[PDB]
């Protein structure tokens, strides 16, 4: 028995899916200090006395601080918050920072190279260690304190019985020397939990409720865990609390006054309905979910007006399958082309959804209204750089001609073209994949600028081009029926039709605003006039 | 003793119901059950909204409801002091009693409530606002450490109010510190009715308000009015009906004989509506009085067809859901009246929100300023239930001059994008 | 700081002067009894 305590469950304490983190922690440090000192000196070396844990806000860092102290078989830790070690009277701050490394010096003199490790916990290690020459109008307390701590931890005076652990949200304000090898080296990051870890996080927090049989058997942990993606431990705790709260309120009543329901809450069991509602309107992630896009680009589903709405899907599926299981070609691209008002931006989201790639995103101009060319380039580069951190991906650039800022007088356009024409050949880092699908409405222009020989294939999206297809589309939409469809069929036969499928959901609506006796005539007149010719 | 009516805050029933559900629900059954669950009570509230919607009344009423010790108050930046290390000392002061009581009873403490006003004055983004000193990048860290972290606290409730929700530090909004983030919005007609009813109760109880006045007309005519605006209208109407008995001459006078027959009339309401109170949201009738200067005459049938087509289009953009967005373009020769047949259609629609984005209010702007103004006028139209917007004289927005040709590209691109961007669901 | 410092200096001055004068007075009187006692 040197340091490790007997109980090493690490699930009894409360920590979740952090197995690898602590294994790496021990492999890199806290290992030599439980080994033959003879061998230690035989190789001859010193120990390591620093770690900095930097993770996104609310990611279990604070809990690790109060739980590492418990598992260590030693005196105790001390937590000193950053904004506390300043005092009004001159000189007090230096004295206070000095006291934190005293009993370790005394033990190195009275028990030189003997005794245990000292643990000092610096919480909010960003509050005090900012810089040395970045302030102004501020006596000098900050610089003096940082200098004192830096010299004390590292300097001529030698210390060997201490371990400093600092914790912070934003590591981009920490001072330089501290991150420089020697004082707080061997940094570590705590990321978001994974799918498996979410199950353990849920289990740890839901044990007490299940102990007393207050949780309905209908609820399933695995369903919720798969449903909730891009969540933090705080968010999961919030979800559980909000479900409990919606039941909490389901029992109480009275808005004029407030009273309990005569202790009628014998079991107040929580059912999956409460979890669903809470996950819907109470808890929302910080990362953000691609749901509004997915349910706003496909606004009316994908009806079937013939064969030209199946071939495209089959070809997209083939391209996805190829990118999934090939090694000679890591990158594959494709272009969708067709006349305007033909449903291309809803035949490219569907193909993306059918494939279940972990990382899907859609970059469209609506998020860059009023941006100069530089900002557009920066945003697109950021999207791709994010896409470069997964074992699969699929990025969709829609309405290309509106990204290049095209207007056919001269003509005139924008850097964006070069960025887009270089980004489309860069292969990703070894052992990964990618797939780019583009949407456009003017093939010839893209041919002119020497962009159509950079894409690997092009598929054609046509529009209704025969009466029978128009009748079938009307039948499946289900607006005109009975004798009305009969007369429309009699009138339409011949002369063909050249109406796009987004222009057939506006004509029907403009037609259904008259009295019932004149609807058919108005629809036919609008089709005849606007229908135009190929 | 308590009653939802007594507090006198009308038009926010859903808001209060939600706050009660998620902030004061775990504190009402016998401790047994709540203890058996091992759940930590929520500690934090953040309220935001455009000025005049009623934020400081909700905090006051919540404070006055609880049968606890009186709440504290911090009027914005009242905790900054010169001597280094005193702001942190002061902010650390507000939690002493709660700490001591938690140590003393334990799991049986009485709520300590802290009410912050203008939370945006002190707690701002770290790294920015860096002009000098650093006493602003330290108070935030002290607050973050205090609210949660070392030590266990379960007997506090912090309430914050602000009108700029895009500057607060992100760390101070993760579930655990400030979890409930509700939103106060402008009232709808029923809310206006409730407000007008509440603010006039004490007068009808003393037969001081003539029966002539009708509340429904006042509610209907008032458009885009907020609570402050309604209170101001009532106050101004009182004052105008109230000045009559005074005799504003040398040696100020007042009549003590006729004063007992003081009465308030709907005409005074109208006078105050058209003289002294003017809302911000919407367009005031003075706007429509400046585009149809000389009415609408009938020179033939081609002045009737246009109006009928306008009626058809407005009706379709209210009762059909396959198409949430519509558009139309009025074209003709110059000097023919295509800005007084486009304001009379918008006026006769009775939509809640109506605006006009003309080119004469942005004389001399560059491209980016015009883009920003257009973006703002369109964004304010995404936060209602159904709205109409008028873009008159397009060819001047994007400067056109036949020589060249020359024009602006950024504005044209902004327009071509903004005519295909569907608004949020159901609007 | 100013008010307390002024209070301190004033009181210190007056007390010190009183003690000094009294000590000198006792010093001067002791010799008379000494000589009479001879």
């Amino acid at each position: 028995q040197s340091i490790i305590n007997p109980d090493w469950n690490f699930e009894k304490m409360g920590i979740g899916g952090l197995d690898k983190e602590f294994s790496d922690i021990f492999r890199r440090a806290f290992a030599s200090r439980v080994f033959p000192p003879e061998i230690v000196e035989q190789m001859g070396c010193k120990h390591v006395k620093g770690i900095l844990l930097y993770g996104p806000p609310g990611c279990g860092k604070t809990l690790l601080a109060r739980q590492i102290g418990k598992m260590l078989n030693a005196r105790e830790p001390k937590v000193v918050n950053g904004p506390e070690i300043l005092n009004k009277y001159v000189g007090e701050s230096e004295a206070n920072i000095r006291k934190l490394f005293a009993d370790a010096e005394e033990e190195q003199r009275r028990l030189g190279a003997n005794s245990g490790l000292h643990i000092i916990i610096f919480d909010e290690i960003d509050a005090i260690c900012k810089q040395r020459g970045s302030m102004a109008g501020s006596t000098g307390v900050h610089d003096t304190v940082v200098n004192q701590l830096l010299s004390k931890i590292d300097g001529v005076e030698q210390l060997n019985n201490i371990l400093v652990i600092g914790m912070t949200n934003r590591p981009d304000l920490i001072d330089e020397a501290l991150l420089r090898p020697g004082r707080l080296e061997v940094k570590m990051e705590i990321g978001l939990p994974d799918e498996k870890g979410r199950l353990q996080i849920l289990h740890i927090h839901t044990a007490r409720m299940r102990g007393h049989q207050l949780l309905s058997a209908d609820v399933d942990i695995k369903e919720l865990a798969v449903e909730t993606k891009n969540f933090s431990g705080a968010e999961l705790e919030g979800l559980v609390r909000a479900a409990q709260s919606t039941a909490m309120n389901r029992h109480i009543k009275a808005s004029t006054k407030v009273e309990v329901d005569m202790e009628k809450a014998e079991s107040l069991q929580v059912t999956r309905g409460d979890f669903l509602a809470s996950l819907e309107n109470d808890i929302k992630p910080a990362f953000g979910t691609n749901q509004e896009d997915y349910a706003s680009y496909i606004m009316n589903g994908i009806i079937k007006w013939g064969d030209p709405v199946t071939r495209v899907l089959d070809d997209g599926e083939l391209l996805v399958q190829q990118t999934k299981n090939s090694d000679r070609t890591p990158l594959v691209s494709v272009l969708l082309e067709g006349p305007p008002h033909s449903g291309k931006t809803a035949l490219a989201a569907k193909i993306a959804e059918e494939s279940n790639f972990p990382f899907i995103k859609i970059c469209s101009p609506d998020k860059m209204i009023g941006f100069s060319e530089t900002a557009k380039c920066q945003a697109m580069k950021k999207i791709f750089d994010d896409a470069y951190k997964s074992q699969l991906s699929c990025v969709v650039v829609d309405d290309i001609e509106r990204l290049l800022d095209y207007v056919p007088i001269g003509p005139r356009f924008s850097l964006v073209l070069q960025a887009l024409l270089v980004l489309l050949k860069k292969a990703p880092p070894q052992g990964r994949k990618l797939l780019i699908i583009g949407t456009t409405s003017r093939k010839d222009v893209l041919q002119e600028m020497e962009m159509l020989n950079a894409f690997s294939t092009t598929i054609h999206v046509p529009n209704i081009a025969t009466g029978e297809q128009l009748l079938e589309a009307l039948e499946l939409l289900g607006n005109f029926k009975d004798k009305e469809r009969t007369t429309i069929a009699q009138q339409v036969k011949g002369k063909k039709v050249w109406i796009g499928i987004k222009k057939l959901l506006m004509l029907i609506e403009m037609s259904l605003q008259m009295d019932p006796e004149y609807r058919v005539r108005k629809f036919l007149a609008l089709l005849r006039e606007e229908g135009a010719s190929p | 003793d308590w009653n939802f009516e007594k507090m006198g805050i009308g038009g926010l029933d859903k808001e209060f119901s939600d706050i009660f559900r998620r902030a004061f629900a775990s504190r009402v059954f016998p401790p047994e059950i709540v203890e058996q669950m091992g759940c930590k009570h929520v500690k934090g509230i953040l309220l935001y909204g455009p000025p005049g919607c009623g934020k400081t009344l909700l905090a006051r009423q919540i404070g006055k409801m609880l049968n606890a010790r009186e709440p504290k108050v911090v009027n914005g930046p009242e905790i900054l002091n010169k001597y280094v290390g005193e702001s942190e000392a002061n902010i650390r002061k507000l939690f002493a009693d709660a700490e001591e009581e938690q140590r003393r009873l334990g799991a049986n403490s009485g709520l300590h409530i802290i009410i912050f006003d203008e939370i945006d004055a002190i707690c701002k983004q770290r790294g920015s606002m860096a002009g000098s000193t650093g006493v602003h990048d330290t108070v935030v860290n002290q607050l973050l450490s205090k609210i949660d972290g070392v030590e266990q606290l379960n007997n506090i409730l912090v309430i914050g109010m602000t009108n700029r929700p895009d500057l607060i530090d992100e760390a101070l909004l993760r579930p655990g510190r400030l979890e409930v983030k509700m939103e106060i919005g402008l009232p709808d007609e029923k809310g206006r009715l409730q407000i007008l009813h509440i603010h006039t109760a004490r007068m009808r109880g003393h037969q001081l308000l003539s029966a002539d006045v009708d509340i429904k007309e006042l509610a209907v005519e008032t458009k885009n009015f907020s609570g402050a605006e309604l209170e101001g209208l009532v106050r101004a109407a009182q004052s105008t009906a109230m000045n009559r008995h005074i005799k504003a001459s040398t040696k100020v006078e007042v009549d003590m004989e006729k004063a007992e027959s003081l009465q308030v009339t709907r005409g005074d309401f109208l006078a105050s509506l058209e003289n002294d109170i003017k809302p911000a949201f919407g367009t005031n009738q003075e706007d429509y009085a400046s585009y149809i200067m000389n009415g609408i005459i009938k020179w033939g049938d081609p002045v009737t067809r246009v109006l009928d087509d306008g009626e058809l289009l407005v009706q379709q953009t209210k009762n059909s859901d396959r198409t949430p967005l519509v558009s139309v373009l009025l074209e003709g020769p110059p000097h023919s009246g295509k800005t007084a047949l486009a304001a009379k259609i918008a006026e006769e629609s009775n939509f809640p929100f109506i605006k006009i984005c003309s080119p004469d209010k942005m004389i001399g702007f560059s491209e980016t300023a015009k883009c920003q103004a257009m973006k703002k006028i369109f964004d304010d139209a995404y936060k209602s239930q159904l709205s109409c917007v008028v873009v008159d004289d397009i060819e001047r927005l994007l400067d056109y001059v036949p020589i060249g040709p020359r024009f602006s590209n950024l504005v044209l691109q902004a327009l071509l994008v903004l005519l295909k961007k569907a608004p949020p669901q159901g609007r | 700081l100013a008010d307390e410092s002024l209070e301190s200096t004033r009181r210190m001055l007056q007390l010190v002067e009183e003690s000094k004068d009294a000590g000198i007075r006792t010093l001067v009187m002791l010799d008379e009894q000494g000589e009479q006692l001879e």
């Binding site: 009004k88 109008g137 006596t139 | 010169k82 001597y83 000193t133 | 301190s8 007390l15 003690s19």
Partner: peptide, 29 residues
């Protein structure tokens, strides 16, 4: 733009007093 201005803070030193009064008064008495 070149015009950059600044705010500032101050400190103190403090001394010892509280019971010296008792000693001085006792001596005088």
């Amino acid at each position: 733009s070149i015009s950059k201005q600044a705010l500032s803070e101050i400190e103190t030193r403090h001394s010892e007093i509280i019971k010296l009064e008792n000693s001085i008064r006792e001596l005088h008495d």
